[PDB]
Amino acid sequence: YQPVALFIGLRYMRGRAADRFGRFVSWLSTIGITLGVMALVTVLSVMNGFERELQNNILGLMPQAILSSEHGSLNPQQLPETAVKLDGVNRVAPITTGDVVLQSARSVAVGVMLGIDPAQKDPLTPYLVNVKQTDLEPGKYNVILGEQLASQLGVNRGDQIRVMVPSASQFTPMGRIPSQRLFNVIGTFAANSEVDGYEMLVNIEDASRLMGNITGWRLWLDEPLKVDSLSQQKLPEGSKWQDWRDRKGELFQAVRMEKNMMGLLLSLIVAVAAFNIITSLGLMVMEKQGEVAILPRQIMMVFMVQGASAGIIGAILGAALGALLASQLNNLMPIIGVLLDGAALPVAIEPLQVIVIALVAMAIALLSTLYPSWRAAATQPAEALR
Amino acid sequence: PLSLLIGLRFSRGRRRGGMVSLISVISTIGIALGVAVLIVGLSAMNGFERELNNRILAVVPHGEIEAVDQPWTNWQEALDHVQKVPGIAAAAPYINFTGLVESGANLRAIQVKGVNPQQEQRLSALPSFVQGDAWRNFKAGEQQIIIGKGVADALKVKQGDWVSIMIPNSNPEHKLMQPKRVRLHVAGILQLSGQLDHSFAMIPLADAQQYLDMGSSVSGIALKMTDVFNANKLVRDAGEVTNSYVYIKSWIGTYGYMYRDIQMIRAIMYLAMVLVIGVACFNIVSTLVMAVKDKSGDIAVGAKDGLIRAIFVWYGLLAGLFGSLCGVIIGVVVSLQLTPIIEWIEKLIGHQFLSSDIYFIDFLPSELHWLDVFYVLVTALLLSLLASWYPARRASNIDPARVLS
Amino acid sequence: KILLQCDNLCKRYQEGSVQTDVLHNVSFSVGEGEMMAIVGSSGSGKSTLLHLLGGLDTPTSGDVIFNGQPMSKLSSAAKAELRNQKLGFIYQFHHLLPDFTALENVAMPLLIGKKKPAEINSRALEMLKAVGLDHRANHRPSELSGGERQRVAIARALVNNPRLVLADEPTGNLDARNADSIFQLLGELNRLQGTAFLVVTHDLQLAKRMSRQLEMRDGRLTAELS
Amino acid sequence: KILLQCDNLCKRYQEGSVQTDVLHNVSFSVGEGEMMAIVGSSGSGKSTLLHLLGGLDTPTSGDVIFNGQPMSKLSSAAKAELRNQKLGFIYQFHHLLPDFTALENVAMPLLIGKKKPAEINSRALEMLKAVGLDHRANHRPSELSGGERQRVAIARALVNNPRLVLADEPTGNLDARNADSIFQLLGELNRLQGTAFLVVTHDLQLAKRMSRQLEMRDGRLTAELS
Ligand SMILES: Nc1ncnc2c1ncn2[C@@H]1O[C@H](COP(=O)(O)OP(=O)(O)NP(=O)(O)O)[C@@H](O)[C@H]1O
Ligand SMILES: Nc1ncnc2c1ncn2[C@@H]1O[C@H](COP(=O)(O)OP(=O)(O)NP(=O)(O)O)[C@@H](O)[C@H]1O
Ligand SMILES: [Mg+2]
Ligand SMILES: [Mg+2]
Description:
- Chain A has 386 residues and is α/β, with parallel strands linked by helices.
- Helix content of chain A is 27%, strand content 11%.
- Chain A has a domain of 135 residues.
- Chain A has eleven helices and ten strands.
- Chain B is an alpha+beta fold and 405 residues long.
- At the A-B interface, helix 1, helix 2, strand 2, strand 3 and strand 6 of A face helix 1, helix 3, helix 5, helix 7 and helix 8 of B.
- Bound molecules: phosphoaminophosphonic acid-adenylate ester (2 copies) and magnesium ion (2 copies).
- One phosphoaminophosphonic acid-adenylate ester sits at the interface of chains D and C.
């Protein structure tokens, strides 16, 4: 036998009928936990896989609103990198943002400039094709073109272009003559995003727009959702907070609403199976009268293991079954029919999430047992049948 | 018209033997928990899919037919060739502009496009989102322009004031000319949410004909087909009557993640929102094995096998059909007027757990979609007939070794 | 006549991977109008043969010919035609429905017989007058007593007027003060329309009112050997 | 001393919304080493008082004093601490599970009573060996005979050597041959160590074997009336 009288009084209480029908219905609570975990580590794995592609595409195309000046430009001597102190910043770098037009020999295109530093770190560094990071010498003004701009212009290697600014124009007495300089091309970078279309690379030290100073120092935030809430931060004299054009401000709420709306819906399949424990223990209170009831706190603790017997086997079986289908959705032969996407499915299985999510399906089998077990001790013995 | 299997089997469903009503409120609510939220999950996904085909797909055209950097002069004959084909209903030309704006010393990128005021409501739902009293005043002659609300959030402009919009000076000879300055006024604003509200602007077609100094020439031809998924194969077989060169470019690119989460999340609901009925259907089977003893049909008792199954398929309809008609009353009060209730979760727990690192904060969405209220009620009751058929097949040959008839 | 015929009957059953049962060479024959009693030991096999001639056993060795037709050469959906019209079920552990009343439990062949709607309260209350229980009709089976609800199951099978009433210890809860008043009632139906019933027991003092004594010794029976 | 005393027990039921009072001020006493017989009618009072002396319902009418302690201020958890030594319950409807082991069914009230692991296979076998039932050890109650499993339930409550056994018709399914074979084993337990018990019957010829006869009708008892 067993030295403890707790795991022996429930081994013969999970189906001892010699038939082909009544034996499988005793393990019906095992199916509700095995398929409950199977529908738990599958939807949450493909949801985090779709959210992982959002972080790879963000913070890699353009910065946001950082600094401004209501009195003209900003001088780097009066405001160094040690004076400004914000939260979430890790590294600063100079930047010059301004929309300029291009006078080519085939068509006309408009794009914004990027005054990067050749001696510092750039986010477009792994996307450099046939170009070096230290090629923007003061006096040469090298322009690096992309994919979508050269499709309608045809600017090859060794072509002189003409970039003009529409805003930075002196008020001449005879019309408005804008400022323009001579330029050249050195290569073509490829990133497969929006930066290849209307975003050019220029040197930080230039006299084509103003004067000599810079506009400010760009930064990278850890989360682009809390920019509107962190707009009430302190600002020194000579700066102004601008609108950050919240494309992912309220749209990120709509793509995370499915985690909170379907997540309450997906928390019900482990709650529907909680009523399966009560309908599997409501008939046990009338048969326990005769063995351990008519003939003190541990007497009612016999059903907490049998009420959680489907929670131990059904969790370690549904985890291997849920990981077999979530990791291979379109890898196996599709017997359902037409595949909608069928190409480049991203997965995301966190090791820190599978330990916490295995405790939710375990703790529900112990907390949903105390309420049927309360009707086995306080209730009178000889009142159910006789 | 009371038959023989429904008239003499009504008194067997009602029972009263003590602790019955405490367990009778488990099966009818357990079958109702998967249907009352099924009308919420089908309305939340279709409510977000309705916004995809209204402010994203309905505002961007699909078919693009252009020339080799040249205004297509003979565009009247191009409308007669592809108009009545099986798959393309209507079409309307458009001319793109690459000018910039300068108002109030605020700089922002803009992609102004040319839409005809009489050829915009037959193939697109873009001017159908006006918040004013009427939108029929948008015409040509007085140089009107309707812009989005994203321009006014950065350029602080007002509806009714005059702004300055710069246009590129065109020239048939490749040289440098002076930039033109055209002063326009805002005669109404259009609202979008956060994405395309700061890059679009609509001018009439007759105003576009006077800016580039052309008589009867356009540049691009826009259209819209029936389906929304097949976009990489229907445009390629629709350019055999035009010239050999057209700008072929399907709408795929940086906005790829907004389409993957509307087609595969719907695909996994066939294994998640169908599985919630699959766990809830175990409740009606556990009461059948509970009632396999002391029942007319499993006891010793020239009819067919339908007399035994008549008491098994009717007990599932006593709680399954009553639960589906009860969950729809409490299911519509949470999908229309919802309130936050998740506030008391970490106050009375005794021992602190659930160490948070990064999560999301729930809020209240906004949707309105009510058409799948009767088709979802009929498919949630037919499988309960097969859910009681399988215990009814194994309820005919039982040896009475332990039970005495 | 004759009504019952059987020959070379043998039962097979498995008990722990060994094909062992307790039944060998049974031989029973009943008539019309006469009653008998079967005395068997605790472990002799009296209940195994009781579920055998009633159409509740497939021994696949012999044949039980009742009313001019066998019990094995027919489909399984038509085996219940000889179970309420010409067959009774009386047992010591009566399995009653605990979710209904006592009037619905005794009228079990009346509801499934597709009879008249004015016939349900016509013969169910008449059989309770013969046993003398009229004040315990519209109650729960838990409200019914120990020694009186055994007598309720006696009048449950004697409703549709069967031909063979199969008994299994009818005097299990009631005492001998009420046994002699109910033993005169079973002898009254044979003088009214003609019926036959076998009442098994283990004691011979209360079985003195039977017209035929055929005890059983592990299946075999020849004469009065004790 | 006198063991059990009871007076002013007006039991009233609430189910059915009707007055169904069957008990009143019954003046009964239970001696030590003396066996009595509750000769109650079939339905009069001999199931409510059977469950009342064991402490299973609170009538809120009087006091049931038992061996110095009452059952008034006993909680739902502190009740089972006192039912281990001086109490014992024997049923007649055979409230047992048909999916257990026959040797483990009599050994069931020994695991939670804080006993030795080597004492489970010793005290559960010496009771079944003296009664003569030792060949049905590794079987299920679905396979036991009609008189086999009935004798198992009699020796179920006799495993902790109690001082009061609450029984009703031990000769229910078993006959008179198995009655005096087990009535002697109930007599030796009173003469070796002393076991007082009461047997609830209805018949008058069976109660003459004992030494104390008290007849009861609807809770009323004065003398030997008939
Ligand atoms: N379906 C079955 N067919 C045949 N034998 C069976 C079946 N089920 C169980 N048995 C065995 O056959 C015997 C059943 O008889 P049992 O339950 O001991 O009562 P009995 O002695 O035969 N007659 P009774 O004393 O009135 O109960 C046991 O040995 C069982 O293991
Ligand atoms: N739920 C109930 N509602 C009302 N009255 C009840 C209920 N349950 C039981 N009773 C009554 O309580 C009685 C209990 O039986 P009682 O007469 O006290 O013992 P007894 O019947 O003589 N012993 P026994 O013949 O072996 O069952 C029943 O006969 C009913 O009259
Ligand atoms: Mg009794
Ligand atoms: Mg029997």
